[PDB]
Amino acid sequence: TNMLYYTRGFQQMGIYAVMIEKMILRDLCRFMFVYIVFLFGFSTAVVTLIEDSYNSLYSTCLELFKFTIGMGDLEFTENYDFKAVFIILLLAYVILTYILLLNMLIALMGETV
Amino acid sequence: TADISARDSVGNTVLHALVEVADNTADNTKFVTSMYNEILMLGAKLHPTLKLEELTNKKGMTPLALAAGTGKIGVLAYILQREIQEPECRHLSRKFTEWAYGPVHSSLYDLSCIDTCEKNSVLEVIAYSSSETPNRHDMLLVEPLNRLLQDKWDRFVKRIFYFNFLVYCLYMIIFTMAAYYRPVDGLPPFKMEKTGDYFRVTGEILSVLGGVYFFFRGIQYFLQRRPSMKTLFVDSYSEMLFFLQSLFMLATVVLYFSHLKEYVASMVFSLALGWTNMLYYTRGFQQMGIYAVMIEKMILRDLCRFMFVYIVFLFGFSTAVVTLIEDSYNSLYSTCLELFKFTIGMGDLEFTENYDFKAVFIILLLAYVILTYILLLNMLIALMGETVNKIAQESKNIWKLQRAITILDTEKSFLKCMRKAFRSGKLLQVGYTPDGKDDYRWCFRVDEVNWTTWNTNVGIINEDPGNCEG
Amino acid sequence: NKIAQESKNIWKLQRAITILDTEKSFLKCMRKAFRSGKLLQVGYTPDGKDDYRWCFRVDEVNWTTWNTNVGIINEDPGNCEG
Ligand SMILES: CCCCCCCCCCCCCCCCCC(=O)OC[C@H](COP(=O)(O)O[C@@H]1[C@H](O)[C@H](O)[C@@H](O)[C@H](O)[C@H]1O)OC(=O)CCCCCCCCCCCCCCCCC
Ligand SMILES: CCCCCCCC/C=C/CCCCCCCC(=O)O[C@@H](COC(=O)CCCCCCCCCCCCCCC)COP(=O)([O-])OCC[N+](C)(C)C
Ligand SMILES: CCCCCCCC/C=C/CCCCCCCC(=O)O[C@@H](COC(=O)CCCCCCCCCCCCCCC)COP(=O)([O-])OCC[N+](C)(C)C
Ligand SMILES: CCCCCCCC/C=C\CCCCCCCC(=O)O[C@@H](COC(=O)CCCCCCCCCCCCCCC)COP(=O)([O-])OCC[N+](C)(C)C
Ligand SMILES: CCCCCCCC/C=C\CCCCCCCC(=O)O[C@@H](COC(=O)CCCCCCCCCCCCCCC)COP(=O)([O-])OCC[N+](C)(C)C
Ligand SMILES: CCCCCCCC/C=C\CCCCCCCC(=O)O[C@@H](COC(=O)CCCCCCCCCCCCCCC)COP(=O)([O-])OCC[N+](C)(C)C
Ligand SMILES: CCCCCCCC/C=C\CCCCCCCC(=O)O[C@@H](COC(=O)CCCCCCCCCCCCCCC)COP(=O)([O-])OCC[N+](C)(C)C
Ligand SMILES: CCCCCCCC/C=C\CCCCCCCC(=O)O[C@@H](COC(=O)CCCCCCCCCCCCCCC)COP(=O)([O-])OCC[N+](C)(C)C
Ligand SMILES: CCCCCCCC/C=C\CCCCCCCC(=O)O[C@@H](COC(=O)CCCCCCCCCCCCCCC)COP(=O)([O-])OCC[N+](C)(C)C
Ligand SMILES: CCCCCCCC/C=C\CCCCCCCC(=O)O[C@@H](COC(=O)CCCCCCCCCCCCCCC)COP(=O)([O-])OCC[N+](C)(C)C
Ligand SMILES: CCCCCCCC/C=C\CCCCCCCC(=O)O[C@@H](COC(=O)CCCCCCCCCCCCCCC)COP(=O)([O-])OCC[N+](C)(C)C
Ligand SMILES: CCCCCCCC/C=C\CCCCCCCC(=O)O[C@@H](COC(=O)CCCCCCCCCCCCCCC)COP(=O)([O-])OCC[N+](C)(C)C
Ligand code: NA
Ligand code: NA
């Protein structure tokens, strides 16, 4: 990752790596903070609902982080007790994170660039 | 002769009428702002001992607070930056000059009814404005208001806000950690058998005391700040979500002692809101606050248009697919659910071999895929990108208003805890009344420097006997 | 970025085509197209008769044409159609 220092001897790669640092400090920094509010916000909301194994805060923050990377199973646990709660609570996470906030990130990168 | 106090059936004097007539155009603003001076000169020339701007109408609104409320920003800019440079019309000057050494000069704006008048202060009348007041978000760029709220913030509210944040951070930790460790075995209410269960009910007590808290604090927002049916569900997207959090959080108390497991359905919606409602407290932070303004606009401009159209297609093709399935994915849930997976990148194009015509099925999904994943989610990114270009400074001006509403509720809350609102300005003499007395106006300093007004026409300069308040 | 106002102008035309098919459809259900304007006198013909043109009002305000060159103004005998 520190090879990206030595882009600074190259105008088009160096500027690119300047456009990396600004995003990590402007856009990811604002993003990932808000993202972890929702993530831990719905994660706790889901493992609170689970009873029993996905009754952990890791294995539910881990499974809800998969919706980010396009690997979210909307049925990763049948060990709930109210489905409408669970489904309302994930699709809320999905809409607010995958559709809204990752695509909002692309928008802010676009305005940053 | 004509009585300059032009009280009418509605009570609007001439200055009121000149606020009501404005349009926030350049030709009209250039006009009406001038006219106040000559009306004010004449009011001070032909009928002294009656400063004309304190007068009100039937509804009880000064022309200052009538410009604050009716959305008149260029009018309001004049009345706040009013700088009359001539004797016997100078007490009406609103922006004084406490000194000027070289280019530097300390402007001395008055905080007459920007904050803490007996009714309708400019910050209230802007902050506590309804929804469709034009220019509402730009009306705090007007000096001294931009630098007055940043003064109250850095000096009073930044320390109480970051405390209220912390108390809400721990309220969530206490409520989260009291819900994670809930009793799975049995039907409520539950017992404090183990030692940890005493700490757990404690976090449940402390959880409900905050649910009734944000409940009452969401009631009295509708008793202090009386909204209309349009401004319930618009312009107040926070006082509802913290109040809504309490509805779930108190239904959680109903359904715990009503002997049901449905308390989980409500207790869990209080957590998702509760952490999602941490994004309120970004409004004490410029870059995070604007970001959260760029969240609300998307949810209301872009998701709102998007998700509606998306659910037309989704239910449009879902019904089209389960119509084709025969038999298990012969449900409208398990087909809307499977077709929603193409959105999140988890679409199996072969999630059912229990069809009867494959070309129908495949034409019908790839139509859904192209029109939703490739077109409409990427179209969403495009519209966000055009939104972000639009709402760049229009979100910073919503932010300073979010912070402004916070600065004023903080004043009203701590009206007896520590002090009043602190008055955010030094009582200072600016000159002399036309009746021959001191003035002593609550004024807010603004050190300003200008490298082109080299002459420095003295005019007002008050402590020119001094040099810099020493 | 290109099609921002070029799509609002396609929109008003989509709505326009809807407004006119709606007229043609309900030509006998309720009424004709409603004629969307008040038959009003605007002056006098050059042959010396009334005009009575189906006209559409547009309240307009301008804060720079202070002189108000009278010119046409028709119900200046009145003031605001009272
Ligand atoms: C049985 C129940 C069924 C439900 C229906 C019942 C009614 C629903 C509730 C009504 C509301 C519905 C909201 C829908 C989503 C949109 C939310 C949103 O735009 O909010 C922005 C808000 C801004 O502040 P404010 O309002 O103070 O500022 C306003 C505002 O800027 C204004 O433009 C300016 O004039 C001025 O600045 C000021 O006047 O920010 C916050 O309030 C903090 C952040 C809040 C979170 C933002 C993210 C959105 C989360 C939504 C989902 C909730 C979480 C998941 C729950 C799972 C299911 C339970
Ligand atoms: C870039 C830096 C890295 C970021 C990573 C981000 C990733 C997400 C966050 C990561 C950091 C925080 C994770 C939680 C702390 C560990 C405890 C836990 O998981 O579970 C605790 C339970 O109780 C709870 O889960 C609720 C209590 C939360 C209290 C801590 C506040 C965290 C604040 C930040 C939160 C976000 C708020 C927004 C932040 C701005 C106990 O531990 P356990 O072992 O899980 O329980 C098993 C107990 N049992 C066996 C008896 C049943
Ligand atoms: C943000 C808010 C949430 C949004 C959620 C969005 C998610 C999508 C939409 C969600 C809401 C609507 C879902 C359908 C209503 C339930 C009935 C059903 O599913 O199946 C019914 C069948 O018949 C049909 O499925 C077709 C009949 C549809 C009539 C309802 C119109 C819905 C309008 C809105 C539609 C979108 C139009 C565009 C909207 C602008 C009967 O119920 P069942 O149990 O399924 O059938 C089993 C019967 N059996 C056992 C005898 C075989
Ligand atoms: C010379 C390096 C020898 C390295 C040998 C090692 C292998 C080769 C390694 C890397 C490739 C480097 C090739 C350099 C020559 C290409 C032409 C050029 O000058 O630049 C051009 C292409 O620019 C590039 O190709 C720059 C890419 C390197 C960026 C470094 C980050 C990660 C390195 C990870 C490396 C993994 C290493 C693991 C495997 C060994 C662009 O033109 P410019 O220069 O922008 O224009 C003038 C700039 N000026 C204004 C400053 C004047
Ligand atoms: C965005 C602003 C923030 C809003 C925050 C608050 C939002 C919260 C919303 C709603 C709160 C209540 C929802 C949960 C109900 C409690 C559980 C319950 O009793 O379930 C019952 C089932 O009931 C159903 O299966 C039907 C569910 C109807 C609601 C679906 C849409 C709600 C989301 C609209 C979103 C629009 C948002 C606004 C935008 C337009 C019975 O229990 P069960 O065990 O589930 O029964 C079997 C279930 N099974 C057959 C499925 C297996
Ligand atoms: C800004 C804030 C963000 C938004 C926050 C709020 C978001 C709230 C989100 C979602 C709220 C809406 C879904 C509720 C959850 C399901 C609960 C339920 O009743 O399940 C039953 C559905 O029974 C049906 O009849 C469903 C018919 C409609 C399609 C299902 C939704 C598709 C999910 C994708 C929607 C994507 C679009 C998203 C738009 C929302 C299941 O019953 P069952 O026991 O399995 O019985 C099987 C057979 N049966 C189905 C025939 C009965
Ligand atoms: C968190 C980090 C972030 C920073 C913030 C720090 C936040 C505060 C931090 C910690 C406060 C809590 C410490 C006491 C409990 C520890 C012992 C215990 O019971 O352990 C158990 C977990 O815990 C529980 O089961 C108790 C439930 C959670 C307590 C919620 C806070 C209570 C309010 C008062 C708080 C102070 C407020 C008022 C102050 C004036 C161990 O689990 P177990 O036994 O394996 O299984 C669960 C038990 N069961 C199976 C029987 C169901
Ligand atoms: C309970 C007995 C005390 C023990 C509790 C132990 C603490 C555990 C915590 C939380 C548990 C306490 C009960 C929960 C209350 C609900 C949350 C709440 O009120 O938030 C309010 C805080 O604003 C206040 O004025 C809070 C009241 C004072 C709390 C005193 C305890 C803090 C101790 C710890 C201090 C540590 C300091 C360390 C410094 C480094 C929210 O502010 P608001 O102005 O309403 O604005 C939002 C509402 N709006 C969006 C609608 C506008
Ligand atoms: C707003 C102005 C002020 C409001 C008033 C001031 C106070 C407000 C605060 C608190 C007072 C309580 C208000 C809510 C009602 C309590 C729950 C209840 O009655 O449950 C009933 C059932 O319930 C269920 O069957 C489902 C319960 C879970 C629903 C989850 C969503 C909670 C919504 C939260 C509300 C969000 C609403 C959003 C508002 C837009 C219990 O009654 P029952 O007859 O025994 O039914 C048993 C049925 N069963 C056996 C099949 C299970
Ligand atoms: C003080 C708060 C204490 C909270 C303690 C709790 C832990 C810490 C919590 C949160 C981190 C807060 C650190 C604040 C100090 C950083 C430097 C700074 O001032 O701002 C900088 C960084 O800005 C941020 O770091 C703001 C991030 C908080 C946004 C709140 C939303 C979600 C919170 C979820 C929290 C999960 C909680 C669960 C775990 C406890 C940016 O500068 P600025 O300020 O924009 O510039 C001037 C602004 N002005 C114009 C207004 C003057
Ligand atoms: C965009 C504007 C909206 C248009 C809306 C209307 C579009 C509708 C389009 C077409 C309508 C007809 C298609 C379905 C045929 C009926 C079923 C049938 O008889 O299938 C036959 C099979 O036939 C095939 O397997 C070959 C299918 C040929 C068509 C493929 C391209 C059509 C999409 C072009 C899209 C371009 C769109 C325009 C852009 C350029 C026989 O039955 P079977 O049981 O299936 O036989 C075994 C099948 N198996 C071997 C596969 C297993
Ligand atoms: C604006 C509105 C949105 C657009 C709406 C319209 C969109 C309409 C979309 C798609 C229309 C085109 C596909 C039709 C569906 C297949 C039906 C069929 O005949 O299946 C047979 C295909 O037999 C072949 O020989 C297929 C050869 C071409 C590649 C198949 C398509 C690839 C899917 C990806 C295309 C991605 C690109 C998408 C571009 C369209 C299967 O026969 P079998 O029984 O399994 O036999 C096995 C062995 N055999 C295959 C050798 C025979
Ligand atoms: Na993906
Ligand atoms: Na994927």
mmCIF file of C-alpha atoms and ligand atoms in Angstrom, chain A residues 85, chain B residues 215 219 222 233 243-244 246-252 254-255 258 260 262-263 265-266 269, ligand 9:
data_model
loop_
_atom_site.group_PDB
_atom_site.id
_atom_site.type_symbol
_atom_site.label_atom_id
_atom_site.label_comp_id
_atom_site.label_asym_id
_atom_site.label_seq_id
_atom_site.Cartn_x
_atom_site.Cartn_y
_atom_site.Cartn_z
ATOM 1 C CA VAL A 85 -39.483 -7.035 11.921
ATOM 2 C CA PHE B 215 -41.854 11.652 24.080
ATOM 3 C CA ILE B 219 -44.925 16.741 22.616
ATOM 4 C CA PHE B 222 -45.887 20.660 19.183
ATOM 5 C CA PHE B 233 -44.425 15.581 7.971
ATOM 6 C CA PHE B 243 -40.688 11.034 19.059
ATOM 7 C CA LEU B 244 -41.325 8.009 16.832
ATOM 8 C CA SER B 246 -40.391 6.822 21.822
ATOM 9 C CA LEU B 247 -43.648 5.394 20.441
ATOM 10 C CA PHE B 248 -41.874 2.114 19.735
ATOM 11 C CA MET B 249 -40.036 2.493 23.041
ATOM 12 C CA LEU B 250 -43.256 2.928 25.033
ATOM 13 C CA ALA B 251 -45.218 0.324 23.085
ATOM 14 C CA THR B 252 -42.271 -1.829 24.142
ATOM 15 C CA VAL B 254 -46.996 -1.792 26.937
ATOM 16 C CA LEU B 255 -46.218 -5.112 25.260
ATOM 17 C CA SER B 258 -49.250 -6.854 28.411
ATOM 18 C CA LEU B 260 -46.539 -10.681 24.759
ATOM 19 C CA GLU B 262 -44.247 -8.250 20.506
ATOM 20 C CA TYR B 263 -42.084 -5.959 22.677
ATOM 21 C CA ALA B 265 -40.766 -5.845 17.352
ATOM 22 C CA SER B 266 -40.913 -2.385 18.946
ATOM 23 C CA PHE B 269 -37.301 -0.504 15.831
HETATM 24 C C1 LIG D 9 -48.734 10.167 17.698
HETATM 25 C C2 LIG D 9 -49.550 10.880 18.747
HETATM 26 C C3 LIG D 9 -49.357 10.330 20.154
HETATM 27 C C4 LIG D 9 -49.622 8.837 20.293
HETATM 28 C C5 LIG D 9 -50.268 8.441 21.618
HETATM 29 C C6 LIG D 9 -49.421 8.719 22.856
HETATM 30 C C7 LIG D 9 -48.651 7.513 23.377
HETATM 31 C C8 LIG D 9 -47.768 6.825 22.335
HETATM 32 C C9 LIG D 9 -46.842 5.810 22.932
HETATM 33 C C10 LIG D 9 -47.158 4.621 23.409
HETATM 34 C C11 LIG D 9 -48.517 4.008 23.508
HETATM 35 C C12 LIG D 9 -48.653 2.773 22.631
HETATM 36 C C13 LIG D 9 -48.886 3.089 21.163
HETATM 37 C C14 LIG D 9 -48.891 1.874 20.239
HETATM 38 C C15 LIG D 9 -49.831 0.752 20.666
HETATM 39 C C16 LIG D 9 -49.210 -0.245 21.639
HETATM 40 C C17 LIG D 9 -49.116 -1.652 21.069
HETATM 41 C C18 LIG D 9 -50.439 -2.358 21.047
HETATM 42 O O1 LIG D 9 -51.493 -1.854 21.325
HETATM 43 O O2 LIG D 9 -50.295 -3.644 20.689
HETATM 44 C C19 LIG D 9 -51.495 -4.478 20.635
HETATM 45 C C20 LIG D 9 -51.209 -5.636 19.700
HETATM 46 O O3 LIG D 9 -50.014 -5.331 18.949
HETATM 47 C C21 LIG D 9 -49.621 -6.227 18.043
HETATM 48 O O4 LIG D 9 -50.209 -7.252 17.818
HETATM 49 C C22 LIG D 9 -48.361 -5.788 17.359
HETATM 50 C C23 LIG D 9 -47.405 -5.093 18.318
HETATM 51 C C24 LIG D 9 -46.042 -4.809 17.713
HETATM 52 C C25 LIG D 9 -46.060 -3.669 16.715
HETATM 53 C C26 LIG D 9 -44.687 -3.101 16.402
HETATM 54 C C27 LIG D 9 -44.725 -1.647 15.986
HETATM 55 C C28 LIG D 9 -44.986 -0.685 17.138
HETATM 56 C C29 LIG D 9 -45.590 0.635 16.698
HETATM 57 C C30 LIG D 9 -45.569 1.715 17.768
HETATM 58 C C31 LIG D 9 -46.480 2.892 17.458
HETATM 59 C C32 LIG D 9 -46.020 3.759 16.296
HETATM 60 C C33 LIG D 9 -47.149 4.551 15.655
HETATM 61 C C34 LIG D 9 -46.685 5.569 14.621
HETATM 62 C C35 LIG D 9 -47.455 6.885 14.651
HETATM 63 C C36 LIG D 9 -47.560 7.536 13.291
HETATM 64 C C37 LIG D 9 -51.865 -4.898 22.047
HETATM 65 O O5 LIG D 9 -53.288 -4.742 22.219
HETATM 66 P P1 LIG D 9 -54.234 -6.024 22.281
HETATM 67 O O6 LIG D 9 -55.644 -5.618 22.072
HETATM 68 O O7 LIG D 9 -53.872 -6.814 23.476
HETATM 69 O O8 LIG D 9 -53.689 -6.789 20.990
HETATM 70 C C38 LIG D 9 -53.126 -8.117 21.118
HETATM 71 C C39 LIG D 9 -52.965 -8.733 19.748
HETATM 72 N N1 LIG D 9 -52.145 -10.009 19.669
HETATM 73 C C40 LIG D 9 -52.489 -10.944 20.788
HETATM 74 C C41 LIG D 9 -52.434 -10.691 18.369
HETATM 75 C C42 LIG D 9 -50.684 -9.685 19.733
#
